Amino acid sequence: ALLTAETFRLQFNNKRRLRRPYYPRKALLCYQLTPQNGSTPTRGYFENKKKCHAAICFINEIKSMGLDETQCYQVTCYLTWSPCSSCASELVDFIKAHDHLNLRIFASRLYYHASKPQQDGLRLLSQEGVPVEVMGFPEFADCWENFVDHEKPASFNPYKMLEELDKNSRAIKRRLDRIKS
Ligand SMILES: [Zn+2]
């Protein structure tokens, strides 16, 4: 299952939105499990469901895969919104449980307004060794390359989109760095 170009552009657009998002907080998560021995990487994505938030559905997917724990793995997660406090705590517990699994978290946007629970969740994830980094051009390009359907042409120019995303990420990186300590 692959995303469309328009869905990718709408979800990962990091140009600071003006009109507040309405409930529920729609959040996309694309993940890539890469086996370190070289076998086929597994890719997927999850949205916010009333059943589970994207991070929780991702954690449950990794748990249900039943990984060969004699191997080592690299996991990369591209999120549209950075995780909330509860998802951050669940991710910290998931990181601690799996010492054969090196996790990297990237986020397109952090949040519309700053909050103590979300900032403390991000600080907890940072102290555990998996800080929520901001997506730049390499991360947007990798997520575009591997998760979008390219059999059919896009309705827009992808290079201008990647340029706009990279341009907007520069200030969001400063917003993230002002907090991290
Ligand atoms: Zn959440």
Numbering used by the authors: 2 to 182
Text taken from the publication that reported this structure:
A3H is the most polymorphic member of the APOBEC family, as its mRNA can undergo alternative splicing to generate four splicing variants (SVs), and has seven distinct human A3H haplotypes (hap I-VII) containing various combinations of five single nucleotide polymorphisms. Literature suggests that the anti-HIV activity of A3H can be through both deaminase dependent and independent manners, and the different anti-HIV activities of the A3H variants were attributed to a combination of different factors, such as differences in RNA binding and virion packaging, protein stability, deaminase activity, and subcellular localization. Evidence so far suggests that binding to RNA is largely responsible for the multimerization of A3H and some other APOBEC members. RNase A treatment is required to activate or enhance the deamination on ssDNA for A3H and several APOBEC members, which suggests overlapping binding sites for both RNA and ssDNA substrates.
